[PDB]
Amino acid sequence: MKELIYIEEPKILFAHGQKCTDARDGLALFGPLNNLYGIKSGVIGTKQGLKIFRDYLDHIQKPIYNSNSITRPMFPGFEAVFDCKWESTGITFKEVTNEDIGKFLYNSSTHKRTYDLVSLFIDKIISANKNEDENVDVWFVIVPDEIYKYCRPNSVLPAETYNYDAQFHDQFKARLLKHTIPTQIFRESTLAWRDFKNAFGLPIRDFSKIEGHLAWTISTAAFYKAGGKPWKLSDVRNGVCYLGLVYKKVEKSKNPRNACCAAQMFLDNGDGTVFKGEVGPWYNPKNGQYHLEPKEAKALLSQSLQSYKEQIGEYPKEVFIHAKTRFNHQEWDAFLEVTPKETNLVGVTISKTKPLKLYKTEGDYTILRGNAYVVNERSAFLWTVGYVPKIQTALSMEVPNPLFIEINKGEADIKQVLKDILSLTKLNYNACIFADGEPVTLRFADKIGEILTASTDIKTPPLAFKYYI
């Protein structure tokens, strides 16, 4: 018979200084913080894709209702919510002849055809950006289904270009990094899910009751890529910097050369929120070792600290380095050597593979969202996925697992660490959802790790998150 405590909802701040507990309700009731004036879109593909996007734009201009108004909130329209226009009149279109796709998707070698298709798209995108007098803000790519199906790594068709990954999306985003052009990719099947069926007369994907969620997600992503700030956290205390580190492998190389990437978040002294990836891919030649060499660790910490100093004016009073792996002693010593005097260094590990579930005996509904179990002074079990009283439903289907949060190195309070980890999960901009199972700092970094790994020619990659998600 142990004891559990409760952790309250984070508050996400909205326009006019009013607060809420759900992003959707705040967006649909008040409006965003900044006011973008307009969005100009660029469509690339066949005439079918252009018609698909035009129809989808015309459709999303009016309110769409879901199955349940309480389970999933409504969509009162793109312009009625975001106070900006994104319609099918400012579209700038670039065609790709179907013979080009046919002449390219016959080589039967995934690397060569992936490179060829990525080139066939990016060359036209870059040429349109370079040699045209218009102003395109967000570039939408309608990827054909037959192109998508066979560009997976472990998929089969029923040297110079080998220094690249075997995925269309990764390499396509990778070779556009040095030209600074925001990009959004839509599957052809996703936008028009009705016309694509199987040998049963029914859509492969049923979006009948969940068009509101789809509209929310796409509108939020398009707004964020266009330079909008929808919502910000409420009570982030001054002087705290969160820095997540994610490790990755590399597809082809003389050695495994495990790569390290980082992501950063803190307060901007202007009552805002700075959330940017501080990433210059660091390398470890040793096989299987997920600890950086002392020089790499010194470089990473120095870069992060210098970025914080330039952004604000002084060093941070507290640094929580979130990582999914434990740290060894030498890496922590190297972190300590480049550390200022009045700077507390904390190493926290978040893990998921820990077999433990809790069952409610009386009802058939899962556990509360904000509960927490404190094993000791240096570890705890935190719940984030489950039933929320506001949305009257569970975030997952089965009995969810909690997260194991461990204060591996340094001295910190477990309740405060849990509170911060819970509050960090309301700032996922790639989708518009109530809550997630993983904090954003260790999530967005992952995406960076899977973009600037597909190619090796990038030097000084961009930092803003509008070119990676």
Binding site: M1, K2, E3, L4, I5, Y6, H16, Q18, K19, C20, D25, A28, L29, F30, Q61, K62, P63, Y65, S69, M74, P76, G77, E79, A80, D83, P355, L356, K357, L358, Y359, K360, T361, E362, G363, D364, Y365, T366, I367, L368, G370, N371, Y373, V375, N376, S379, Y387, P389, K390, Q392, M397, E398, V399
Partner: protein, 419 residues
């Protein structure tokens, strides 16, 4: 006056009407509507007439398919017409067309010659038009403050959406270990046992460590597999108490706490495996671990304590299974997880990973918390021996006991489970 009436088709037009009411309140307009308030009762019609006649400045009618030809809506329309006639106000009733299906040809006679504010295309355009019309007609208003709208949202939208300070009881998958032997053993067989005898084949758990064998069994135990065992002195046995090595208070150059704890965990795992093999239960090989499952018809009518464990799905049979792991953190436990497996007819397995995974995904859609809880508890209670325990044989006389009831957790905050 200073109030604006809103009428709709309760509860068909909750979305637009509630959105418009919250928006208009956020701009400093006093808005009176039905669904906005919570307290109701018999005295709900006299207030309507008194408010309309006494302190109502503008009448907005949400004209949709549902709201048209509605008895209450038509009564409100008649009262509004009477008030408009009395006040000599030409513009008192304003239609708001929010339904695309509602054509202007089949509209009510009471509103057929009136200029309607359209909301079908974009709700922001209609909101701007309403604001402009109010400004031109000099509708009284206060300063724009979204705080009132936020307060109304917090006190009306989330009335029965708060959290309940109610105590509760939680069942888990953590089974506590009750009993341990007294001492551990490192029998010293100086080139006495065969070099490659494969000590993991003995009738009792054992682990090789230097020239020593580690087991909880007796010194002369498992002598059937090792005939050259009797000629051995007792003084050549290093005995270590279990309490200190579980507490971490035994550091030696012979062995440290880490390796001894590792050996204890390995012994517990092997004992669990052998004991479950004794129960005559079928085995399943996963990617890294191993699971245990019952046949079909092994129990009485495929049930145990009114809980079914084996069933029929399409042309196959589905079997519930549990997997255990011997772990010493934070306190000595044998963690339990659940799985589902599929067989052709309940006796022979189907050799296809994709079929098994797809079948499990299909089956797990409709199962909820209570189903998993009941199945897990039932299968745990199946294993227990006499009243509350389940023993693993670690030697000729040594036993390790695991309780059949999982560890409970007590919480103080819950919800009201409102269907």
């Amino acid at each position: 006056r200073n109030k604006i009436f809103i009428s709709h088709a309760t509860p068909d037009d909750n979305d637009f009407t509630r959105w418009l009411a919250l928006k208009l309140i956020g701009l400093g307009y006093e808005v009176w509507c039905d669904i906005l308030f919570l307290d109701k009762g018999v005295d709900f019609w006299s207030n309507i007439e008194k408010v309309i006649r006494e302190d109502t400045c503008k009448f907005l009618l949400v004209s949709s398919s549902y709201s048209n030809q509605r008895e209450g809506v038509l009564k409100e329309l008649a009262v509004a017409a009477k008030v408009k006639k009395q006040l000599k106000d030409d513009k008192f009733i304003i239609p708001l067309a929010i339904d695309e299906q509602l054509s202007y040809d089949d509209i009510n006679i009471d509103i057929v010659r009136l200029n309607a504010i359209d909301f079908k295309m974009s709700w922001a355009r209609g909101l701007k038009d309403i604001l402009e019309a109010f400004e031109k007609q000099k509708v009284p208003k206060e300063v724009a403050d979204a705080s009132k709208s936020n307060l109304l949202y917090q006190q009306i939208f989330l009335h029965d959406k708060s959290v309940i300070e109610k105590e509760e009881i939680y069942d888990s998958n953590w089974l506590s270990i009750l009993s341990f032997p007294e001492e551990l053993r490192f029998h010293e067989y100086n080139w006495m046992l065969p070099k490659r005898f494969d000590v993991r084949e003995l009738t009792f758990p054992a682990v090789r460590y230097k020239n020593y064998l580690c087991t909880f069994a007796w010194a002369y135990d498992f002598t059937y597999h090792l005939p050259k065992t009797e000629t051995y002195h007792k003084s050549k046995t290093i005995r270590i108490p279990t309490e200190e090595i579980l507490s971490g208070s035994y550091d030696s150059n012979f062995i440290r706490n880490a390796e001894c704890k590792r050996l204890i965990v390995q012994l517990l795992n092997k004992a669990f495996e052998l004991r479950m093999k004794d129960k005559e239960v079928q085995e399943y090989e996963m990617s890294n671990k191993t699971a245990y499952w019952l046949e079909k018809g092994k129990l009485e009518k495929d049930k145990f304590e009114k809980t079914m464990l084996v069933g029929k799905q399409k042309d196959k049979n589905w079997h519930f299974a549990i997997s255990g792991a011997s772990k010493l953190y934070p306190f000595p436990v044998l963690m339990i997880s659940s799985h589902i497996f599929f067989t052709a007819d309940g006796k022979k397995l189907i050799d296809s990973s994709s079929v098994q995974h797809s079948s499990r995904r299909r089956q797990g859609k409709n199962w909820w918390n209570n189903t998993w809880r009941t199945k897990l508890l039932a299968f745990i209670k199946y294993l227990s021996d006499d009243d509350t325990s389940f023993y693993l044989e670690m030697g000729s006389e040594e036993k390790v006991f695991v309780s059949n009831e999982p560890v409970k957790f007590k919480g103080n905050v819950s919800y009201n489970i409102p269907e």
